[PDB]
Design an enzyme around this catalytic site. Structure first.
Site, PDB file in Angstrom:
ATOM      1  N   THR A   1      35.882  38.618  46.042  1.00  0.00           N
ATOM      2  CA  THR A   1      34.834  38.383  45.004  1.00  0.00           C
ATOM      3  C   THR A   1      34.491  39.042  43.799  1.00  0.00           C
ATOM      4  O   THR A   1      34.552  40.243  43.817  1.00  0.00           O
ATOM      5  CB  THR A   1      33.642  38.523  45.753  1.00  0.00           C
ATOM      6  OG1 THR A   1      33.662  37.751  46.763  1.00  0.00           O
ATOM      7  CG2 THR A   1      32.409  37.764  44.906  1.00  0.00           C
ATOM      8  N   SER A   2      34.453  38.398  42.618  1.00  0.00           N
ATOM      9  CA  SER A   2      33.846  38.686  41.200  1.00  0.00           C
ATOM     10  C   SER A   2      32.532  37.997  41.166  1.00  0.00           C
ATOM     11  O   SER A   2      32.663  36.798  40.895  1.00  0.00           O
ATOM     12  CB  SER A   2      34.794  38.370  40.155  1.00  0.00           C
ATOM     13  OG  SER A   2      36.170  39.312  40.511  1.00  0.00           O
ATOM     14  N   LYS A  33      30.150  30.334  45.668  1.00  0.00           N
ATOM     15  CA  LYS A  33      29.404  31.607  45.953  1.00  0.00           C
ATOM     16  C   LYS A  33      28.021  31.788  45.201  1.00  0.00           C
ATOM     17  O   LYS A  33      27.140  32.735  45.387  1.00  0.00           O
ATOM     18  CB  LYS A  33      30.281  32.755  45.561  1.00  0.00           C
ATOM     19  CG  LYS A  33      31.693  32.646  46.140  1.00  0.00           C
ATOM     20  CD  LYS A  33      32.368  33.827  45.640  1.00  0.00           C
ATOM     21  CE  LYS A  33      34.014  33.804  46.232  1.00  0.00           C
ATOM     22  NZ  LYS A  33      34.662  34.947  45.726  1.00  0.00           N
ATOM     23  N   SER A 129      34.881  42.993  44.570  1.00  0.00           N
ATOM     24  CA  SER A 129      35.967  43.736  44.509  1.00  0.00           C
ATOM     25  C   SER A 129      36.377  43.636  43.092  1.00  0.00           C
ATOM     26  O   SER A 129      36.913  44.797  42.494  1.00  0.00           O
ATOM     27  CB  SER A 129      37.006  43.340  45.558  1.00  0.00           C
ATOM     28  OG  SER A 129      37.231  41.729  45.292  1.00  0.00           O
ATOM     29  N   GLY A 130      36.344  42.527  42.629  1.00  0.00           N
ATOM     30  CA  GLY A 130      36.808  42.389  40.998  1.00  0.00           C
ATOM     31  C   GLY A 130      36.074  43.135  39.871  1.00  0.00           C
ATOM     32  O   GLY A 130      36.338  43.353  38.821  1.00  0.00           O
TER      33      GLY A 130
END
Ligand SMILES: [Mg+2]
Ligand SMILES: [Mg+2]
Ligand SMILES: [Mg+2]
Ligand SMILES: [Mg+2]
Lengths: 196, 223, 222, 212, 204, 125, 226, 195, 196, 195
Positions: A1-2, A33, A129-130
């Site tokens: 995910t970003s 998302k 995470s991004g």
């Protein structure tokens, strides 16, 4: 995910990639998302997909019942309901949620709820995470009271970089624009954002 | 015993009527960080062999230096170094396979999966695999890592057994390889759009293609 | 932590006849749930009318066969081209295996050939070198599926002569090479149906006084 | 596994079962658990199959070298000690053995040494080793006399293995018998436990718990 | 330690022409120690037969449980339970203990009294049904049984031929398993006669 | 709060009558007629759709209800009581039978379960 | 196990292989993995076989009662919501991985579901040990506006990829087609590309081969009259 | 505790149980009776974890005595053994299971037959001509398999039992301080005071 | 650590923060992480301070002995010596080194040697814990053939952001400029770079 | 192995050592002599890990016999005990240490005195009037503390030893199959064949 949400002059815009991952295998390359909990209150999800879906469904239920009794809830109220679930069940949850909404009284607002279940009201927020790879870029390039077109470019460029460096992120960039005019969905494909 | 740090993902390959094709993307990952974007993982040895390597990049660079040294050494006191006594794909593979098995036997492996693709002196296609454990095997199609799970099923639809090899042209084979690379980009989180492809043909020799890209992609249905 | 061992699947079968011997094995090579190769030869002609297979971890298997083939070569050099008898080969393989007693070749080895009286011979080894001459022996993944069938159909175990009701055993009559191959094919066909690691192809090496012959048969590829 | 050896008037009786298992899976019913070290010495197989095979045929080589050098038959004491000293060097490395070295010489008479992979070396009259050792000891202890005949001693060893084969899941297949004399060992055949059980049940009247 | 292989034992079932067969060994043990050679693993409730392998305490408990349940079934339904229905009852009963299961491998065999159709089924410890047309195997020598059945079995065997096939499948499978054997029983089941045969086998 | 009526509301009178059951039967007597006939190859159940108002859509009120694919029910008496009994009967066919035996209950046993529910409303607190 | 789901013009198709395993051993060679939740809502299951079977029947049972209560034909989103909430509550301990497909008054739908409770939407999906082999085929040949015949072909080709390339999958292809305004058609053993060849030998024994100790008639009849 | 043996002969059941109680380093007692009379013609011996053994045995005893008073009738050995099995089968999936193995020797007055039942802590029941728990069977079963006859007298059963105890005293590493022997027949339960 | 090296028109510039950490305690706030292994070949160190100092001292020794025999070593040669030590002793080392140097024939060159001991020649490189937060910024803002003043600004702005987000990084920004003109040391204090 | 005892009286040293050898489940032997004569007037008993005990004892025996031949002289008990201590002290920091505890009983012919030395596997040496290894001392030392006198005869020492063995046979859980008793005095070493 970003994922990210950014307030601007006319309201707020949410942005996200479309990658879902079980290890190195991309289990879904076209994931949505950006999730609706109320007409003009949406959220970005990161962490366990099971957990964030369960939480979002419960929040949508809570705000639907709130609306039937007390009328349209504020974005702050939606953030509080998210927080209550995340804080009280912190031992059993892995969820990082950004809440974004548009009132007419308060206009565009953004709240971020990290792992512990704390709440932080911000002009803009980044998570997943991004996001680690774009703290520098976003801090240098964010301005308050941007236009719709400028904010779309800021999110497009930001998530482009997050996707470029984070293997867990990828696919299409989706956005949801929240203003007085209504709700607008946007999508941007790899051939567009990779050449930026 | 160690752990891989900077890593390369799938290497894929297959036989066709007049030779072999091999391909691998140009990424060097650092965990989930897509750190290095210009890494060549196909390394040609002479004009008849291409060695494709996945796994640890530091160990790949070491193997690359071993192969470079092998060519130098073969030329020593060898008047037929560019003719009858040139390095064969089979010689290069057996050497690597020996090293890999010896290194695993000292409990200090080269953390790689390797595919040696080439054409022998008599025109025969050569395609064989070796990994960090010293395990070796041959097949009409070969692939490492994710490629083994996703590329092989697609490539086996073209060449399912030995008798399908003479019926497979270089155009059909390259088409299949390129499609497999697209599928891997869709589905492997440690892959990149940019890749290299090498063809070793018994008639036209070694064709090395750099800076290739995955194209003709579908997302539109993002529904 | 680094694991120096792996499992490449596979199943092998050796049967000794009156004046012949067969060593068979499937041609499928695997790791976990993936197929590496549908045709990767596993049974090898090692010279001197001896056939060999080392089933289990394929890297150790290839290493052992390679070292034994080498031992045959040097036996000829050192002992005036004397033919290496099957019993002598067996004892030699024990020493190759026990040499790595504390870091073993992770394989189950079987060799086949003829003894010095021309009678069929099969020898079976554990990973660290204990060995036995045997009439019948399956090895690898589907060994447990094959051996009970062979006990019943080769040695006629639990079979008695009709009318006597358990008093007289079914007599152990000798089997031809055609008869043995039928039992080998049916063993692998049945193993293919019930074991996921068994399939693709079956390669049989037959040893007689005339030499080593090969036969190949297709197996189901699912 | 069940292996035994005992001293008596007529020499030594050695009796073993034939079963080898890997977990619950019966790998073999035709294992040779008596190692023929040479025509005068026998060793039994328990623990590691390879360790016992390898090092006891090695022992045969050392015994052969001894008699070439000394022009005299090696004693059971000396032969057993060569093996025990060897395995003691490897102590800690993971060798697995439990064996009886059996022989009959002029100076010693019938002699049995129990040798173990942790270095133990015991001289004795009756030894029993394996997963079914306790069952065989029962039959041995209650029927053993020094003045047994060769015929009765051979049967006692056969019957003791049968007792273990019946009760112990990891023992069975067939019984191998040996009689060790001063002039060498004599093999007394392979006896299938399946056939032997019914034969003994009828002739002896034992195993009334089992329907036949 | 592994509950499904403390006591040992096997069960096998097969279909034939207008008949079914179910068979089991007679051993009960405490790991290496053989304890009983009369521990039958096949039970019946009316014309429906149930074999159970695995942990012996659970074998006994489940027999008592299904006797309990089929007796109440009969009183309320006013008819004997059928193989298809009983199979679902076994599955339901096992799954209710999803996170604290009975360590068993049940096998159902019988002929439907109305249609005359032969029926067999198998289960894992947690209730998943395996409804084979040919054969079902269970126990510590299930691998060996799969090997025997796969080669020995052919469809539409007559009752007396099916007896030989299933008997040889059991016997030779048991002789390659340390924890199985010590006697065996075979049931040959027809629409209105059932024959029970004890087999002679090696006792090691 | 709490339900403090833990005692029976149906009791025997000196003459041995259970008053509340008799009065319930009187309510049934006032109800619209329904019938059932059994044939060799089937069964029929029927009743009148007594519409309370012509503005009411009487198709939305089902007096004849499917309990299982092979079992149906009709009533006479209090409609609302019937509706909840149909809900309970449909559920008990699953919970006490189909989830156990993997098939729908026979008519006599489903009837037995509905009867049990009606008996308990005659004795429970 | 290989299972797939594919959307097409006027509906959705699901498919599955027919091999069930216990470690490396094949327990059943012709297993039925296509389950019915309701007449026009079907699902295929991977993972713990008892869990997929049980969770399907529980939700299927509750869906039937819901349909009777509301006088409406069941919806796929209802089956999805009930399945995910049940699975989330048990925190992954119920090892059910499902592809849920169907038609209802709202239209045609295709979802997937993972043991922890997460759901996915898609035009094409795959699950099980052979999902990577299947997804390779789907990513190579899927297009928008597939016909019924094209979707059945694509789905079975994806299962075949699993059958031939995944050791966890094998035997036959089962298919179920759910088209709008039509009965769902369950095609059991739609493809049969793995029939065993005739054996070399018959293993029928002579009668009297097996040694017998005792024979007796078993009384299966109830206590008799008179 | 340690060794418990049982043998069913022609007309009686004989139970032998060791006398030692060891608390790790020291032998605290050498005269312990590891048995309880459940009813006039039913005896139960026991071995397992400390405390749980006696607690379980006395609990069973109380329950059978309660049944006897309520019905004015002695339950058959088979019925008692089934009750005991169920209690142990219930116990094995409890929070803290009874770690107790038992032998039940009884004389059935209806059938005029002796009966011996062996039940372990899991609830595993078998009827046997002779039985044991722990390592006792490993030493004694080969002797019992040889000499046992179903038509043995009580005296012959005691002699075969002596041979079993002698083998235990020879080959077992632990000193179990001899055994208390009790006979169950048509006249009830009695103790052999010289063994 | 936040460290980087950037090639430009006239050569190459190395940059670094000055924080040394043992836990949360700043053991040295004025550390010099830019180390000289030869006149115009320097390196940036990250990882274990003991390891990277030991390696750098050995490399300096190797290049001093190289120079006495064969004359000035190339930057590639210096990188190779670093790699040899890092690769062959990978089990016992925790070192991430960036090597930067100026030749007259090759001009400015940058080599990065990550944990495994691999070598990568790049136009510019970033490393250390703080580098994660500026992957996006650096990728968007780096151009080839920049001027000295532009490159100083690029490094100053980049490391400013790395310091802002990474607790392990901080203090002063040190820089070393490598050109034909010679070797120039630069230092920038918090009051300067924090207001950027 | 298990129990080894020692007592030094007026004119002799008495060593008592158990006869049992146990391989886990079974007692393989009941007549084992856990002692070696190092020299005509010096005896060493031993207990510890299997194999290592006999290997160490025979190694020491060989070394003392070698010294005796080289010098034509018997080393004093004190000198022998110091040699043994050093070997064990060396062993404890080896790759694989000797897990062996010993008692050394000797009669010094120069001083005309009996001497008893206790040495454990670490190389811990003490001279004592009476000693033991393992758990043996826990049972026997309270009896020895009470009855021991330095002017005891050999017969009185044997009687006190019998009382010690009787207490061991009563309270120890293991059956050690009795003891072999040996006396060391001015005339050398002899075995008491009835004990
Ligand atoms: Mg990416
Ligand atoms: Mg197969
Ligand atoms: Mg046995
Ligand atoms: Mg058996």
């Amino acid at each position: 995910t970003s994922i990210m949400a950014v307030t601007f002059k006319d309201g707020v815009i949410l942005g996200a990639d479309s990658r879902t991952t079980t290890g190195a295998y991309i289990a879904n390359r076209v994931t949505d998302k950006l999730t609706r909990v109320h007409d003009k209150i949406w959220c970005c999800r990161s962490g366990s997909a099971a957990d964030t879906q369960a939480i979002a469904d419960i929040v949508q239920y809570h705000l639907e019942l709130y609306t039937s009794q007390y009328g349209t809830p504020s974005t702050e109220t939606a953030a509080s309901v998210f927080k209550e679930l995340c804080y009280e069940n912190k031992d059993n949850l892995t969820a990082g949620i950004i809440v974004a909404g548009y009132d007419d009284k308060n206009k565009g607002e953004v709240y971020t709820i990290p792992l512990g279940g704390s709440v932080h009201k911000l002009p803009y927020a980044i998570a997943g995470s991004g996001s680690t790879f774009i703290y520098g870029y976003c801090d240098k390039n964010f301005r308050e009271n941007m236009s719709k077109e400028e904010t779309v470019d800021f999110i497009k460029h930001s998530l482009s970089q997050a996707i470029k460096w984070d293997g867990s992120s990828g696919g299409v960039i989706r956005m949801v624009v929240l203003t007085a005019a209504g709700v607008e969905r946007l999508i941007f494909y790899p051939d567009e954002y990779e050449q930026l | 015993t160690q752990q891989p740090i900077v890593t390369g993902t799938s290497v894929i390959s297959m036989k066709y009527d007049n030779g072999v094709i091999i391909a691998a993307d140009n990424l060097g990952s650092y965990g989930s960080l897509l750190r290095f974007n210009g890494v060549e993982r196909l390394i040609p040895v002479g004009d008849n062999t291409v060695v494709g390597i996945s796994g640890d990049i530091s160990d790949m660079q070491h193997i690359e230096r071993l192969l470079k040294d092998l060519v130098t050494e073969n030329a020593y006191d060898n008047p037929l170094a560019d003719a009858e006594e040139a390095l064969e794909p089979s010689y290069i593979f057996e050497y690597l396979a020996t090293v890999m098995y010896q290194r695993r036997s000292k409990m200090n492996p080269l953390w790689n999966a390797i595919i040696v693709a080439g054409v022998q002196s008599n025109g025969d296609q050569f395609l064989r695999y070796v990994n960090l454990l010293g395990v070796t095997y041959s097949s009409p199609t070969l692939a490492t890592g994710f490629g083994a799970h996703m590329a092989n099923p697609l490539l086996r639809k073209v060449v399912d057994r030995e008798s399908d090899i003479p019926k497979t042209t270089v155009q059909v084979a390259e088409e299949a390889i390129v499609n497999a690379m697209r599928v891997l980009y869709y589905r492997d989180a440690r892959s990149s759009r940019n890749f290299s492809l090498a063809i070793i043909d018994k008639n036209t020799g070694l064709t090395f293609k750099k800076n290739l890209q995955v194209e003709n992609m579908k997302w539109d249905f993002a529904k | 932590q680094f694991n120096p061992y792996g499992d490449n699947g596979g199943t092998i079968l050796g049967i000794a006849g009156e004046d012949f011997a067969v060593l068979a094995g499937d041609t499928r090579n695997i790791t976990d749930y993936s197929i590496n190769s549908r045709y990767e030869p596993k049974v090898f002609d090692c010279g001197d009318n001896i056939v060999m297979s080392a089933n289990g971890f394929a890297a150790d298997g290839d290493a052992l066969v390679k070292r034994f083939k080498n031992s045959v070569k040097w036996y000829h050099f050192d002992h005036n081209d004397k033919k290496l008898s099957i019993n002598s080969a067996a004892r030699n393989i024990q020493h190759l295996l026990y040499g790595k007693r504390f870091f073993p070749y992770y394989v189950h080895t079987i060799i086949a050939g003829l003894d010095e009286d021309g009678k069929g011979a099969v020898y079976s080894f554990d990973p660290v070198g204990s060995y036995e001459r045997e009439q019948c022996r399956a090895g690898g993944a589907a060994a447990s599926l094959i051996m009970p069938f062979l006990d019943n159909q080769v040695n006629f175990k639990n079979q008695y002569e009709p009318g006597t009701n358990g008093k007289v055993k079914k007599p152990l009559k000798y089997l031809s090479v055609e008869e043995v191959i039928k039992l080998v094919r049916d063993s692998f066909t049945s193993a293919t149906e019930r074991h996921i690691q068994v399939g693709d192809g079956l390669e049989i090496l037959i040893v007689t006084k005339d030499g080593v012959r090969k036969e190949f048969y297709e197996l189901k590829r699912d | 596994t069940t292996t035994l050896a005992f001293r008596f008037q007529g020499g030594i009786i050695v009796a073993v079962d034939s079963r080898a298992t890997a977990g619950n899976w019966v790998a073999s019913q035709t294992v040779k658990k008596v190692i023929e070290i040479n025509p005068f010495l026998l060793g039994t197989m328990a623990g590691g199959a390879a360790d016992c095979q390898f090092w006891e045929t090695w022992l045969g080589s050392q015994c052969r070298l001894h008699e070439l050098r000394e022009k005299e038959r090696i004693s059971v004491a000396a032969a057993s000690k060569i093996l025990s000293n060897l395995v003691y060097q490897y102590k800690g490395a993971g060798l697995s053995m439990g064996t009886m070295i059996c022989g009959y010489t002029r100076k010693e008479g019938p002699t049995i040494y129990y040798v173990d992979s942790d270095g133990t070396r015991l001289k004795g009259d009756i030894f029993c080793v394996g997963s079914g050792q306790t069952f065989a000891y029962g039959v041995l202890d209650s029927n053993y006399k020094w003045d047994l005949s060769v015929e009765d001693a051979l049967y006692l060893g056969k019957r003791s293995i049968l007792a273990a084969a019946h009760r112990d899941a990891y023992s069975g297949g067939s019984v191998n018998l040996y009689h060790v004399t001063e002039d060498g060992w004599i093999y007394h055949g392979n006896h299938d436990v399946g056939e032997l059980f019914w034969k003994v049940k009828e002739e002896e009247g034992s195993f009334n718990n089992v329907i036949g | 330690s592994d509950p499904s292989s403390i006591n040992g034992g096997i069960v096998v079932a097969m279909t034939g022409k207008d008949c079914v067969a179910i068979a089991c060994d007679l051993r009960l043990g405490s790991q290496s120690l053989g304890v009983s050679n009369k521990f039958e693993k096949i039970f019946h409730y009316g014309h429906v037969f149930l074999g159970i392998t695995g942990l012996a305490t659970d074998v006994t408990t489940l027999n008592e449980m299904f006797r309990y349940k089929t007796n109440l079934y009969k009183l309320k339904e006013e008819r004997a339970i059928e193989p298809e229905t009983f199979t679902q009852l076994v599955s339901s009963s096992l799954y209710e203990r999803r996170f604290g299961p009975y360590f068993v491998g049940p096998v159902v065999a019988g002929i439907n009294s109305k249609s005359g159709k032969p029926f067999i089924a198998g289960f894992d410890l947690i209730g998943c049904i395996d409804e084979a047309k040919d054969f079902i195997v269970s126990g510590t020598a299930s691998d060996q049984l799969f090997g025997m059945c796969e080669s020995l079995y052919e469809p539409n065997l007559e009752p007396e031929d099916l007896f030989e096939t299933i008997s040889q499948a059991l016997l030779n499978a048991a002789d390659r398993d340390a924890l199985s054997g010590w006697g065996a029983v075979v049931y040959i089941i027809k629409k209105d006669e059932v024959v029970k045969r004890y087999l002679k086998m090696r006792q090691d | 709060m709490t339900d403090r009526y833990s005692f029976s509301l149906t009791t025997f009178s000196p003459s041995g009558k259970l008053g509340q059951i008799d009065y319930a039967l009187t309510a049934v007597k006032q109800g619209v007629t329904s019938l059932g006939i059994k044939a060799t190859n089937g069964v029929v159940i029927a009743t009148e759709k007594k519409s309370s108002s012509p503005l009411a859509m009487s198709e939305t009120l089902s007096k004849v209800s499917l309990l299982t694919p092979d079992i149906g029910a009709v009533y006479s008496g209090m409609g609302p009581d019937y509706r909840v009994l149909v809900d309970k009967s449909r559920k008990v066919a699953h919970t006490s039978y189909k989830r156990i035996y993997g098939e729908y209950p026979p008519t006599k046993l489903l009837v037995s379960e509905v009867a049990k529910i009606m008996q308990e409303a005659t004795q429970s607190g | 196990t290989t299972i797939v789901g594919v959307k097409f013009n006027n509906g959705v198709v699901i498919a599955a292989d027919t091999r069930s395993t216990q470690g490396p051993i094949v327990a059943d060679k012709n297993c039925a993995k296509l389950h019915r939740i309701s007449p026009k809502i079907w699902c295929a299951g991977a993972g713990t076989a008892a869990d997929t079977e049980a969770v399907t029947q529980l939700i299927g049972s509750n869906i039937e009662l819901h349909s009777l209560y509301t006088s409406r034909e069941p919806r796929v989103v209802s089956a999805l919501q009930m399945l995910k909430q049940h699975l989330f509550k048990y925190q992954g301990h119920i090892g059910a991985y499902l592809i849920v497909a169907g038609v209802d008054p709202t239209g045609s739908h295709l979802f997937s579901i993972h043991a922890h409770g997460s759901t996915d939407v898609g035009y094409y999906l795959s699950l099980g040990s052979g999902s990577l082999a299947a997804m390779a085929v789907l990513e190579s040949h899927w297009k928008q506006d597939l016909t019924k015949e094209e979707a059945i072909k694509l789905a079975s080709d994806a299962i075949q990829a699993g059958i031939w390339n995944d050791l966890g999958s094998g035997s036959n292809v089962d298919v179920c087609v759910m088209e709008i305004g039509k009965d769902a058609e369950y095609l059991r053993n739609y493809l049969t590309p793995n029939v065993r060849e005739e054996k070399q030998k018959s293993y029928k024994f002579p009668r009297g081969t097996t040694a017998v100790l005792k024979e007796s008639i078993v009384n299966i009849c109830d206590i008799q009259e008179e | 505790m340690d060794i418990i043996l049982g043998i069913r002969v022609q007309d009686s059941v004989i139970l032998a149980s060791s006398k030692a109680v060891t608390r790790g380093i020291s032998v605290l007692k050498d005269s312990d009776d590891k048995t309880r009379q459940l009813s006039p013609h039913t005896l139960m011996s026991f071995a397992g974890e400390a405390g749980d053994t006696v607690q379980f045995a006395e609990y069973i005893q109380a329950n059978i005595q309660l049944y006897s008073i309520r019905e004015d009738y002695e339950l058959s050995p088979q019925a008692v053994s089934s009750f005991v099995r169920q209690e142990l089968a219930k116990s094995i999936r409890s929070r803290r299971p009874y770690q107790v193995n038992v032998l039940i020797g009884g004389y059935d007055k209806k059938k005029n037959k002796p009966e011996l039942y062996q039940i372990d802590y899991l609830g595993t029941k078998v009827e046997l001509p002779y039985g044991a728990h722990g390592y006792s069977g490993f030493y004694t079963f080969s002797l019992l398999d040889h000499h046992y006859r179903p038509d043995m007298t009580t005296e012959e059963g005691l002699d075969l039992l002596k041979l079993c105890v002698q083998e235990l005293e020879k080959r077992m590493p632990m000193d179990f301080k001899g055994v208390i022997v009790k006979i169950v027949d048509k006249d009830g339960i009695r103790q052999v005071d010289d063994f």
